[PDB]
Design a protein around this ligand. Structure first.
Ligand code: JC9
Ligand code: NAG
Ligand code: NAG
Lengths: 368, 355, 86, 46, 50, 51
């Protein structure tokens, strides 16, 4: 069995000196220990590495255990040094598809997208987890006075001082300023206006100003608060920025995957790929690390793992229409007698909600 | 490649012929330089290229020398200036809504004051008016003019009604504050400020780019506008957009389609266009053909057939659709100047009454 | 509401192969050159133009207090009569 | 209809508000447009 | 707060988002179309099979 | 507490013009806090979280 090192579906954890490590118990309890997998130490970072056995549980281990229990067949989980998913040569296949074609593994139980060429060469049976492609972008609290500024504060202070002094200038003293300060914001004093000739008119005039200014301040701060930042910056492929490549924007996708096949399927999308074919990444982890530091504008075509990455990071938002609707399946060799058995087993497991239980127990655990 | 390339490909698909695109040798567009044209117009009048495709604005001078074709996209002359940040109109003191509600509240205050004076009789009027104002504006605690408790029900219910009215006024103000009309100080070329910047305000630049059909049209329409814009002759398109973004360039008076595309790009959030569908000299980018062989009819029919179908609409949606098109609320002193003006008017009225 | 899915321009149709096509085309281009069509549009459309709080949220409380004033004065009179007869 | 008035011979011009399509341009030329408009749907206000 | 929330409840006027609206594009018993007879609208609608 | 909320019957505890600054600034802070709370409640009333 060939498996890919996708952290949301297959986590990477080196074993201890004893050859095995005990998995931490969950809320439900009774954790399932992952089988020994001979994966690369660092996924071949440009240099050969020893095939040190590592423990990798992730998400697909439970599905593989269920399939093995239903079909009663032994399994040998191992990764690939190249790490590629599969694409056209340069007349053969490379990565997991190449391993399947070469006969090294008779079946592949791993998260893998399905396209025209892959479906033609091998059968994916029935998918278990459906995921439509979406884009993720790294996402990029008011003042204590809101609409008023330092200049506005000085102006209003000068105005209130002027009206306060004019009150006792027209009345004639010192108590007028204190009364004005007290009545500026609720409160009140027992003296009040004299209301002899024109004091009552001035008091009535200077009674609604406070209500008006506080209402304006509240309205301005409420308008500022409801000024939510735009989250749907790119509306999928329909967005002109996504449809038409730009020098400033950088498009990143997993190399040697079904993304290249999908882009080459449509001629009108060739300028989407050919103009942006040198920015691909051989591994998704490197792309995620690069986009964490805001080095990459956005990432696409890994939605089934991009959603989990965004949930775990709680910083990168996910938008875009689900233009490519498909699901992860299990791959078998050509004319494999076990294809019907595994298809029936996966359909039976999906019917009773085992996949939903696994999803709600693992993916829903990290909600952010 | 581009929108014009797609149009040419569609034309070739509809009508089978041979074409060989050639870049412009000298200049950018047509210009009557000592009676000799240049650019695409100069090439087509010299029989170098029978068909001219590009940003060739249709005008009488261009049509006189070389025949035009049916336009497929509407363009013209537009102004895209957004450096100034204008807030909402200063209507906080007196909003257009509830215009008669203030008068109704005033007459109700007068009526309740008269009723209170009458029941007290069976300085009183002034005390009742002061109590009503204190209960309404809730600025300060009013002195309780009545001495008994039976009459307190009326003043309590009136104070409750005044509180409800004040709450409704605050809610209406909050609802009005979320408006995002963004009425900028823009009027178009018809405004005297744009026509004669020197007479209106020396800190103003037309920014019209020369060597183009729009510049020639502006010069023919108004000589003063051309003379004013000659001191701010920008070069290129990207440089002019960068200058406008940095604030060095006051405004852009280039083609409407180019302005819309620039406003729809990354550097267009603070450089939006006028926002009005109607533009000055509404024309299109028709293909210039010599029509010597009578081939204009075929290309016109092909363009009409393409426009009738949905290919033109989807192509325009793919290409001629920018981003960040059309609450971004902002605070300014002019927005709050209304309450200051109202306070000044009230103070002047009080001073006049006292004197 | 809705977007403009057909940007069509009203034209001046004439007879087939009419000899006056050039003259009318030049005139219609000069009309846009001097903004005569824009002036007509501004004269016509703008002239024939047109456009929340009201008495529904304002006159109700006034009517309620006007109705309650009678009850209040009646209660005051009843209290005065009771005090006099006490 | 109206398009027949410009072909039967009762008139020489059809100057009136009329959208331009791909059928009326087959034989008679409409020169250049003077007013551009987009087709939009209108409904009664709620 | 509730009064302010009620007052900002604008009436939805953009019921139809142009010709691309699925409610208008798909014929319905409640919906009734209308157009000027013997005009360019019929030619435009009948120009394409869509 | 009288100045923070709707006005009620007051008590003339202060005696002099030199002690009104503290109560005045306390009332100003209280009314500012009340206005901010009302504005925040109004902003949250239109939230789409409720379903
Ligand atoms: C004190 N007066 C205000 C008030 C705040 C909260 C509750 C009632 C009221 Cl009445 C201050 C905030 C703006 C509205 C207003 O009238
Ligand atoms: C227009 O361009 C030509 C060369 O392309 C140049 O000689 C001429 O000075 C330019 N005119 C203006 C007004 O910039
Ligand atoms: C107004 O807009 C300009 C540019 O659009 C911006 O630089 C400025 O910060 C804005 N001011 C406010 C108060 O939002």
């Amino acid at each position: 069995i060939v498996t890919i090192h996708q952290e949301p579906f297959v986590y990477v954890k080196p074993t201890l000196s004893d050859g095995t490590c005990k998995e931490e118990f969950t809320v439900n309890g009774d954790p399932v220990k992952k089988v020994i997998c001979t994966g690369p130490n660092d996924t071949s970072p440009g240099s050969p590495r020893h095939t040190v056995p590592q423990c990798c549980y992730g998400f697909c281990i439970d599905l593989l255990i269920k399939l093995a229990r239903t079909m009663n067949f032994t399994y040998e989980v191992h990764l690939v040094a190249d790490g590629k998913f599969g694409t056209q040569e340069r007349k053969e296949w490379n990565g997991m598809m190449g391993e399947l074609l070469s006969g090294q593994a008779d079946m592949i139980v791993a998260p893998l997208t399905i396209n025209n060429e892959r479906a033609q060469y091998i059968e994916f049976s029935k998918p278990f987890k459906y995921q439509g492609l979406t884009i993720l972008v790294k996402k990029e609290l008011d003042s204590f006075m809101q609409p008023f500024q330092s200049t506005l504060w000085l102006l209003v202070g000068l105005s209130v001082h002027v009206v306060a002094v004019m009150l006792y200038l027209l009345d004639r003293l010192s108590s007028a300023m204190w009364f004005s300060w007290g009545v500026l914001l609720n409160s009140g004093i027992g003296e009040g206006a004299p209301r002899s000739f024109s004091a009552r008119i001035l008091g009535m005039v200077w009674a609604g100003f406070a209500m008006i200014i506080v209402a304006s301040y509240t309205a301005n701060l409420a308008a500022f608060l409801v000024l939510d930042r735009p989250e749907e910056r790119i509306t999928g492929i329909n967005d002109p920025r996504l449809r038409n490549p730009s020098d400033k924007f950088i498009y990143a996708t997993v190399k040697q995957s079904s993304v290249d096949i999908y882009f080459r399927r449509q001629v009108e999308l060739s300028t989407m790929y050919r103009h942006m074919e040198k920015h691909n990444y051989e591994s998704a982890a490197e792309a995620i690390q690069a986009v964490r530091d805001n080095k990459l504008h956005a990432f696409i075509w890994d939605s089934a793992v991009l959603e989990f990455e965004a949930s775990q990071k709680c910083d990168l938002v996910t938008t875009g229409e689900l233009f490519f609707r498909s699901g992860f399946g299990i791959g078998m060799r050509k004319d494999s007698p076990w294809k019907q058995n595994v298809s029936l087993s996966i359909l039976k497991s999906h019917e009773n909600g085992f996949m939903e239980d696994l999803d709600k127990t693992w993916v829903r655990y990290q909600e952010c | 490649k581009g929108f014009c390339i797609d149009i040419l490909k569609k034309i070739s698909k509809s009508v089978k012929f041979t074409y060989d695109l050639y870049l412009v040798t000298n200049g950018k567009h047509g210009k009557k330089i000592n009676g000799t044209w240049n650019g695409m117009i100069g090439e087509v009048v010299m029989k170098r290229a029978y068909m001219a495709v590009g940003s060739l604005t249709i005008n009488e001078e261009r049509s006189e020398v070389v025949d035009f074709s049916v336009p497929f996209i509407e363009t013209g002359i537009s102004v895209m200036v957004s450096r100034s940040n204008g807030t909402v109109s200063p209507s906080a003191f007196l909003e257009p809504f509830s215009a008669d509600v203030w008068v109704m509240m005033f007459v109700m205050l007068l009526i309740v004051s008269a009723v209170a004076v009458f029941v007290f009789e069976y300085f009183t009027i002034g005390k009742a008016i002061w109590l009503l104002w204190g209960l309404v504006f809730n600025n300060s605690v009013p002195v309780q003019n009545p001495k008994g408790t039976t009459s307190k029900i009326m003043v309590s219910v009136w104070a409750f009604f005044a509180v409800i009215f004040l709450a409704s006024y605050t809610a209406n103000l909050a609802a009005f504050m979320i408006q995002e009309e963004y009425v900028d100080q823009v009027s178009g070329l018809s405004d005297k400020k744009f026509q004669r910047p020197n007479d209106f305000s020396p800190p103003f630049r037309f920014g019209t780019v020369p060597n183009g059909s729009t510049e020639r049209n502006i010069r023919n329409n108004y000589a003063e506008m051309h003379a004013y814009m000659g001191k701010f002759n920008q070069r290129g398109v990207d440089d002019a957009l960068l200058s406008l973004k940095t604030g060095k360039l006051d405004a852009f008076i280039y083609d409407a389609a180019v302005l819309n595309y620039m406003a729809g790009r990354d550097e267009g959030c603070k450089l939006v266009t006028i926002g009005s569908g109607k533009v000055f000299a509404s024309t299109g980018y028709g293909i210039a053909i010599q029509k010597d062989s009578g081939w204009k009819r075929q290309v016109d029919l092909a363009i009409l057939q393409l426009f009738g179908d949905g290919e033109m609409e989807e192509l325009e949606a793919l290409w001629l659709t920018g981003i960040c098109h059309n609450m971004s609320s902002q605070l300014d002193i002019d927005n709050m100047a209304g309450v200051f003006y109202m306070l000044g008017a009230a103070m002047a009225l009080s001073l006049i009454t006292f004197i | 509401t809705g977007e403009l899915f057909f940007r069509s321009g009203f034209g001046i149709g004439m007879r087939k192969d009419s000899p006056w096509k050039q003259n009318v085309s030049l005139s219609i281009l000069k009309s846009h050159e001097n903004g005569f069509m824009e002036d007509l549009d501004k004269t016509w459309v703008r002239y024939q133009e047109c456009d929340t709080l009201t008495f529904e949220n304002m006159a109700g409380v006034f009517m309620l207090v006007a109705g309650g004033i009678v009850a209040g004065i009646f209660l005051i009179f009843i209290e005065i009569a009771y005090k006099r007869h006490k």
